[model samples]
Target: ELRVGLEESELWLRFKELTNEMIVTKNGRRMFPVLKVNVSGLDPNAMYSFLLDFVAADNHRWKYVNGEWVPGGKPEPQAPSCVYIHPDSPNFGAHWMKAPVSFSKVKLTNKLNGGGQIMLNSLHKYEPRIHIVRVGGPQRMITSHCFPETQFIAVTAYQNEEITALKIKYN
Candidate 1:
């Protein structure tokens, strides 16, 4: 069995406490805390491919009204989906296990232009999932993982002042 661990989980946990909000833009935005992860229990000599996709955690459209988030209304129709494939994929498991996988390059966007960026809806909650596939075998072995604490709401701007300050502190 394969196992995955969150990198800087403490930081993500802190953001989760504040109801983690990720800023999205027309041009696509890189996620904060970067969604880095470490994995173990893979065959060192086996080749593997890694990818990420963000799935809506709930159907409610959120609003940061007054001092807190509330279910505003129905969610906007989600645009077509796409997965972010790691640039260094199809590598040996040994290489993947050598260090924490950082998804710093994956960007979130609200635009429908489709330039290979992960499309997301604003004011909606989402949870990111990581997929791993072992290659060069008769049957490719696959696995996936998600961290509940890493869930966040996509926003056009920081709706909460406290989250803005916290994000800036680490920048």
Candidate 2:
């Protein structure tokens, strides 16, 4: 059966307090606040593949001013989204339940001149999503986790000065 829950809510909130800024670029960059989760309630013999993708958290462009992010204007047209399958995918559920799933290797880019990278629009808010697909079977099941706290704004530049300092200090 498909089942999952928060394995790292505390970890998620710790990052959120810093305003979770993912430095996206034309050349592609790894998300600083990566999508990590613990999954359970599955058949151990079955293997699964994990994927990561970003969805617009809102329909507005954002601007950080004075210390907050506010809607700036209507957003630019977005493109068809891309998905990143975990490099360690297709592993048995037994290993999955024990090892926390993470997509630290995933990269995001705003430039269209690319292949296989998750694409996003600069200055837009995004929610990171994870999909776990069972490798085979007559049923062929799929499950997903979309953490609310895992959401953040993608920018070519850091928006909030306070947030910038917070991340640097925390690191």
Candidate 3:
């Protein structure tokens, strides 16, 4: 078995604040400030999997378009499964937390390669999730944590403006 630990600081605390805000209709609302994490608990010579997931607030599904939250013409279909690999994950988990890590740089997307752009609904809302997976030898385990129940919020460009502004101020 492997052990993993998290570092507590102001960064994590601020993330909680952003998740509580209400979102409005608009394009390019930024996410409430995101948490920056640094991990370090693994064999230096092992391989691991890094994944991110998005969770909806409730079962009601709809799409945002035309600057309004409209009922989706069809019931929301299952979103495709996609997990982003950290560019430096190849170095193994030992080096993960050596420096301050910020997942804020990551973008969520529906595209397979994550090239098109981060996925978004015009007026719809969404919450983002991040996970760290361990895969090596005979141990296949995962360590995960959601920022906070508040982290999930309406998904829109306008709603996230305040959080975005905060991030710029700090970073």
Candidate 4:
């Protein structure tokens, strides 16, 4: 069985309400309100792989004008989907059920030349997704989960006044 929970949903939701944004640089930026998740109800004897993928949530391209995001035009072609495997992937299922998994190490970047960074397009809405795989079992099983509220728009600069204000106040 596959079960997933957002580790700190309240804070995440707060960022969501503010219309969360992640800065993309030539040098990748580590995401905040990190994708912390807890999984359970698995076979202790089996090994599992944890993965995360960032994908375009919509096809619209947004532009910042007059302090608001407006549809700039049709989105550019998407980069091939990239999946970031958990650093400690292929660990025992018992290990996951015992505690939460933190994916803070993953970073976002718009540049493909960077160090294996996840390639994302600027001004596009993207959703973070989670995947769980059971390895070393009689048969391999894969499961995926995504949170609607976890969607975010990528930008080099902050477009939302509230978001910039919140960042200044909190960060």
Candidate 5:
């Protein structure tokens, strides 16, 4: 089974509770329950890759109208589109997952230069996905069995909050 080794579980628990509250607009809304995952169970000598994608809330296209962004008003008959992979993805996984594991420095953006400003409509909802890949060599490979399928979670409006701490434990 997969377990989380957090430096402080209470912080995460409090963040989770904050997600239940209403998020305001005009100003940014920080993601209270940010993920701070520390993974293990891997061949140390292998190579790996990591990527993150953002899933859109709906299929309808958004437009900037009357100084604000809005949906098409009527729902499109098709499901939402595939998520957009973060432009700065496919980073070396093994190098990242090495000891002293941390993603505390990474920042998700929505600006034009940084992956088109996170592609979203005001007041609309979204979700984010984090992908981890292991490359043993030119052809051999293995992925986390537990999270083989793409892992996803709901996204929230941007809020300027700092990650005060993170800790990983391995048995």
Candidate 6:
């Protein structure tokens, strides 16, 4: 079966425990944990493209209160979804499965831009989505995966002191 494994799972989980917070600046900030992964069960000779995107993890808006995040109110209307295509896309599946794919170059931003940075709303919880597409074959195919540990709340600045300390210590 085709499977995608999250890289740096332990680090992701560590941030998750304190409620991960990803900073979104006007210029864009690189994701701290970095959404990296390894793939299996792909046709070695086939061509493929891997993509990354974000979706709301829940319906409610989040606010940091009493050292924890709680529902603040209804979330702002979501902006149009943005998708980041791996620069090495459309490469042979063999190349992808050969090593771990890293999206360390991916950036998060609140102000919209055309520079390929992912735009997200502050205070909204989001989960990263991984999509794999097999192209130029008899029939195109698509598969998507996500890890709960990869979920984080987007912010202009970190809201929790504990999260800030953890980020500094490990990242």
Top-lDDT candidate index: 6
| Higher-ranked by lDDT: 3 or 5 | 3
What TM-score, to 2 decimals, does candidate 1 have?
0.94
Q: Give TM per candidate.
A: 0.94, 0.87, 0.58, 0.90, 0.44, 0.94
How much lDDT does each candidate structure score?
Answer: 0.87, 0.76, 0.50, 0.81, 0.38, 0.88
**Tens digit per residue, CA lDDT, model 4, 1-171:** 577888878777887887788888888888776788888787877899999998787777877777666776555666655888888988998888888899888888888864557878888888999889988778988889997667788888788978777666656
Q: Please write out the lDDT profile of model 5 over residues 35-96, one tens digit for every residue.
A: 34465654446555544444554655444355334567776544332343333344444444
User: What is the number of backbone collisions in each predicted candidate, taken in the order shown?
Assistant: 0, 0, 8, 0, 7, 0
Task: Quote the positional error of residue 43 for candidate 6 in Å.
Answer: 0.9
Residue-level lDDT of model 3, residues 1-171, one tens digit each, is 443333455654564555433333322233434445555665667766656555554445454345334455554644533454555654566566466445544454322342413454333345555577766558776777554543444443434555667656765
Indicate the residue-level lDDT of 149 in model 5. 21
Question: For residues 1-171, could you state the per-residue lDDT of candidate 6 as single tens digits?
Answer: 998999889889989988899999998999888788989999899999999999888767788888879986655566546899999998998999998999888889988897889888888889899889998888999999977888999999989988889888987
* Candidate 4 residue pairs in backbone clash: none
Candidate 6 global lDDT: 0.88
Instruction: Give the total clashing residue pairs for model 1.
Output: 0
What is the Å distance of residue 133 in model 3 from its true position?
2.5
lDDT at position 91, candidate 4: 95
For each candidate, C-alpha RMSD in Å? Answer: 1.6, 2.1, 5.8, 1.9, 9.3, 1.4
**Candidate 4 residue spans exceeding 4 A from truth:** 75-80, 168-171
| Stronger candidate by TM-score (3 vs 5) | 3
Report the Cα lDDT for candidate 1. 0.87
Q: Which lDDT tens digits does candidate 2 get at residues 21-41?
A: 788777788865556687878
Model 4, position 71: C-alpha lDDT score: 74
